[PDB]
Nucleic acid binder design. Structure first.
Ligand SMILES: [Mg+2]
Ligand SMILES: [Mg+2]
Lengths: 131, 45, 138, 217, 114, 111, 162
RNA sequence: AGAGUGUAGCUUAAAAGCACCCAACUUACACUUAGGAGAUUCAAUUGACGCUCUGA
């Protein structure tokens, strides 16, 4: 009898995975694709906070999907005050996020707030951008 | 808790020296940045 | 991580069909607590970032404490208990140090599972076990 | 049961200055900057400090330092604008500029008829409006300031009770962007208190456990 | 005696008479010597409260004490079959160097016919 | 018009040749297959076209064992590392329980 | 080819209006190429001006008194980050448990407050905050004691009004 | 005042296994490799400290 009372014993594809907004009405809006943008006049401090964010999210099991970088700004001394010249540059980097709740929303912002270092800026938003 | 991300190296291989430069903003506030050409000050117009 | 989990499943009951079917104190921890705390300083953590670990003192510690538990395994793997006693295990708490004479010196010892030649075992072995009436049986 | 309807908020200023770094943290910045130097490579400062030097050291027998002290003299003439508003005042604890390295909470007083309750600022919610704007109406009225000041969340942070008719209190959270606190020497008895300073400003369990929604640091 | 010559798809090969398994964990490192049946014959873990006294230094310590015990158990030939990332781990290179120099050879001589 | 052309291949004759509980001498082909359906178990080999043969003279049994692939098998180690943590794979295997003991000690002389 | 399918749908027929959208789309090709923002690359990549000039500053040594010092500071650092992470991790632990009961109370008290609390305010979308600094100050780019870096206004131009 | 009790985070673990932390690779994460850290609330199943509860 081919099949058996042990049929389906090895099925490796419903277990594994295969191959906007977050709607969720009433509880409502369970923040979806948000790009938190880490920007600094430094390089190492900006990277070390994306370091801190990404490890924070996986600790809190809320999903991250990108960690890429916006490329670098090319500005001198802006010659608005013998006219001065020295190139100070800015290093921006993207951290994405996919899963958030309403009830973790204001809290998970605080751990980003309280731990945010010297001279860096965040900016949460939705998604319409490319490199 | 502004110290959690404070201390780090350069995580790259080939790279110039970065010096402890104190840039300072329109709002009066100064910041420890890292920059070449060790002007200890930079002032942004 | 999966190989750790998957080798747990091959000891389970498994109702279907398995290859295994056809082919199968209180002062003790208190003294040990200060022991590691004391032993964490004389390594100066300078012997970490290449210590030797003298085995012979360790062996005397092993034979007293976890000798007999371990020694029961070899007496079952070699299948003494299913030939000696028809099953019916025992855990030997008396450490039996038996050895034979290679002439004058040295001693070829017998451990639990060793190999000694019958040239060495012509004459009866020199025995000590450091315990207190016994019959010894070969 | 009849329940006494009452709302609240909690306000926080952020640290505008980073924390003074600990004695273990100060060493690590020294070692990490040391190891940054030796792995470094092709320095524009040292391309002109070592190897223009060897032609200026043998032209005489046949830049680097003149640019140094100019980088020191504006380092010297610029007196650093102070991080110090602690030892000068020592007393004006209702200042918006007292602490620089830690988060604060706004803290007021109402001599009640029944008790005399030192209060973490509250509100009352009418049957029409939300619980969320019930926070929002009180920084305008109860203290007469101009705090354009973002709120965070609609779900609250703290819930403690007192039943004699039962009462309730619903603690929220918010921040400051900037501060126009009008007429700071007002006798609406208010004060800007840290975590470490409200240990002797709270008596009761209705306020003793509101530390369970502050960032502890 | 027969080695189980099959199992060409799965890992590890179950063709041996005596294997060497090591269990790297937190706070400890174990080393088991097994038969084909899964009956462990000698062991040396740092739970033993005898080598708890006196990490890589913990790993190369067991290569000293267990190669002491296989000679005391008559076990002279081994097989060590690791994942290719712990074969290049600095702990196991010191384990095998205390094991092949400690007396046993980890190579399992051939099952002679004819 | 019948644009379709080519499907005139004959049947491969691939399947179990020695079913469960059969006596199998050493070298008999237990099964022939493509796209693994039965993996080798104890005393069962694999040839180039994935057939299964018996390595010892015995009796063939079929079990359901736990599938751990080789860590160089890069097409299927990523098969593991997308499973959730309760998961094991459970392929099926073909064993040969050997019947004959591999020899006996016999008197040859009296010397 | 949805970029050029507007083009020849206007090129084939040719009224007057069809010539405006075709012309504007050539601008709107280069508008979309400046609206979507593949033209830039990262400066993660190394300039090979840094390639040959590695051999300018190679000298290092190591000493046992440095090395033993470099040992324990990292262990104390591995100690220091370990407890303060736990303090941070019990902080978020304690501030959700003071959320979780604080939601179950009003949700089991009042059904109007039940629905009102689980939504939020959409001012979390435009949130942007700047870091703590070394100096706040009481002012600034220096008010005119004798120093300044603000752009001072006599014959007033930073902008065209003043 | 009444109560449930009680192994570091967790555990039909009994001084264990997982989690966790810092490095080194990775844009980062992950993996791996080198390390790091810890508990039976205390006295003879009792008695007595820590929390969480039911109080005013
Ligand atoms: Mg066909
Ligand atoms: Mg046909």
């Amino acid at each position: 009898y081919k099949t058996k009372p042990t049929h389906g014993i090895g099925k490796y594809k419903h277990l594994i995975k295969a191959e906007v907004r977050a709607i969720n009405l009433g509880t409502d809006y369970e923040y979806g694709v948000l790009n938190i943008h880490l920007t600094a006049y430094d390089m190492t401090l900006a990277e070390s906070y994306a370091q801190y964010v990404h490890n924070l999210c996986n600790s809190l099991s809320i999903k991250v999907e990108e960690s890429y970088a916006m490329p670098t700004k090319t500005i001198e001394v802006l010659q608005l005050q013998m006219l001065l010249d020295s190139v100070l540059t800015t290093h921006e980097r993207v951290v994405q996020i996919s899963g958030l709740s309403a009830t973790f929303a204001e809290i998970f912002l605080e751990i980003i707030q309280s731990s945010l270092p010297e001279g860096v800026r965040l900016s949460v938003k939705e998604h319409t951008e490319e490199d | 808790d502004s110290s959690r991300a404070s201390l780090t190296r350069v995580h790259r291989q080939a790279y110039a020296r970065l010096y402890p430069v104190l840039l300072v903003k329109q709002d009066g506030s100064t910041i420890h940045i890292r920059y070449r050409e060790p002007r200890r000050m930079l002032a942004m117009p | 991580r999966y190989r750790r989990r998957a080798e747990q499943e091959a000891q389970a009951p498994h109702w279907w069909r398995t290859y295994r079917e056809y082919f199968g104190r209180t002062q003790q921890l208190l003294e040990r607590k200060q022991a590691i705390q004391e032993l964490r300083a004389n390594v100066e953590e300078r012997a970490a970032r290449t210590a030797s670990v003298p085995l012979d003192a360790v062996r005397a510690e092993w034979e007293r404490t976890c000798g007999p538990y371990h020694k029961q395994r070899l007496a079952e793997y070699y299948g003494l208990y299913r030939d000696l006693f028809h099953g019916a295990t025992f855990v030997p708490r008396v450490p039996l140090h038996v050895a034979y004479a290679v002439g004058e010196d040295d001693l070829m010892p017998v451990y639990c599972g060793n190999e000694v030649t019958p040239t060495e075992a012509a004459q009866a072995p020199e025995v000590t076990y450091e315990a207190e009436l016994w019959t010894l049986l070969l | 049961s009849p329940w006494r309807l009452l709302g609240a908020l909690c306000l926080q200023r952020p640290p505008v200055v980073s924390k003074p770094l600990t004695p273990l943290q100060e060493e690590m910045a020294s070692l990490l900057q040391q190891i940054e130097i030796e792995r470094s490579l092709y320095s524009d400062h040292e391309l002109r400090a070592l190897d223009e030097n060897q032609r200026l050291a043998k032209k005489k027998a046949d830049l680097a330092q003149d640019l140094e002290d100019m980088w020191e003299q504006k380092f010297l003439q610029f007196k650093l604008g102070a991080r110090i508003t602690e030892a000068d005042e020592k007393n004006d604890r209702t200042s918006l500029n007292r602490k620089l390295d830690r988060n604060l909470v706004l803290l007021v007083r109402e001599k009640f008829g029944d008790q005399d309750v030192w209060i973490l600022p509250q509100a009352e919610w009418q049957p029409g409006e939300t619980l969320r704007g019930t926070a929002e109406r009180t920084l305008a009225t109860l203290s007469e300031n101009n705090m354009e000041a973002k709120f965070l969340g609609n779900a609250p942070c703290g819930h403690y009770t007192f039943k004699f008719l039962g009462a309730k209190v619903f603690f929220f959270k918010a921040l400051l962007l900037t501060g126009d606190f009008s007429q700071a020497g007002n006798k609406g008895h208010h004060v800007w208190v840290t975590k470490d300073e409200l240990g002797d400003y709270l008596k009761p369990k209705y306020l003793a456990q509101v530390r369970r929604f502050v960032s502890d640091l | 005696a027969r080695k189980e010559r099959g199992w060409r798809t799965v890992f590890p090969s179950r063709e041996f008479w005596h294997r060497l398994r090591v269990i790297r964990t937190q706070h400890h490192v174990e080393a088991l010597v097994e038969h084909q049946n899964g009956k462990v014959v000698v062991s040396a873990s740092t739970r033993e409260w005898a080598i708890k006294k006196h990490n890589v230094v913990a790993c190369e310590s067991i290569g000293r004490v267990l190669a002491q015990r296989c000679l005391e158990a008559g076990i002279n030939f081994m097989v060590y079959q690791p994942t290719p990332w712990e074969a290049a781990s600095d702990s196991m290179k010191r384990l095998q160097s205390a094991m092949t120099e400690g007396g046993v050879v980890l190579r399992e001589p051939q099952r002679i016919y004819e | 018009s019948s644009k379709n052309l080519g499907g005139k291949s004959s049947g491969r004759r691939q399947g179990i040749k020695k079913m469960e509980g059969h006596y199998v001498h050493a070298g008999n082909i237990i099964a022939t297959q493509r796209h693994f359906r039965w993996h080798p178990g104890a005393h069962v080999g694999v040839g180039k076209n994935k057939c299964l043969y018996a390595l010892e003279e015995g009796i063939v049994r079929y079990t359901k064992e736990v599938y751990v692939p080789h860590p160089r098998n890069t097409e299927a180690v990523d098969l593991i590392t997308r499973l959730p943590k309760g998961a094991v794979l459970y392929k099926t295997f073909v064993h040969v329980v050997p019947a004959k003991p591999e020899g006996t000690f016999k008197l040859v002389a009296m010397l | 080819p949805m970029r050029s399918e507007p083009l020849r749908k206007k090129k084939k027929v040719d009224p007057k209006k069809d010539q405006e959208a075709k012309e504007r789309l050539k601008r709107k090709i280069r508008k979309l190429e400046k609206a979507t923002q593949l033209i830039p690359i990262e400066d993660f990549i190394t300039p090979l001006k840094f390639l040959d000039k590695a051999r300018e500053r190679p000298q290092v040594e190591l000493t046992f008194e440095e090395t033993e010092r470099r040992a324990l500071l990292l262990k104390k650092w591995s100690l220091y980050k370990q407890q303060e992470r736990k303090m941070e991790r019990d902080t978020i632990r304690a501030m959700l448990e003071a959320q979780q009961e604080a939601l179950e109370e009003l949700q089991l008290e009042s059904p109007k407050l039940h629905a009102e609390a689980i939504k939020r305010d959409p001012n979390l979308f435009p949130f942007e905050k700047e870091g703590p600094h070394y100096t706040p100050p009481i002012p600034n780019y220096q008010p005119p004691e004798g120093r300044y870096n603000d752009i001072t206004k006599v014959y007033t131009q930073v902008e065209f009004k003043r």
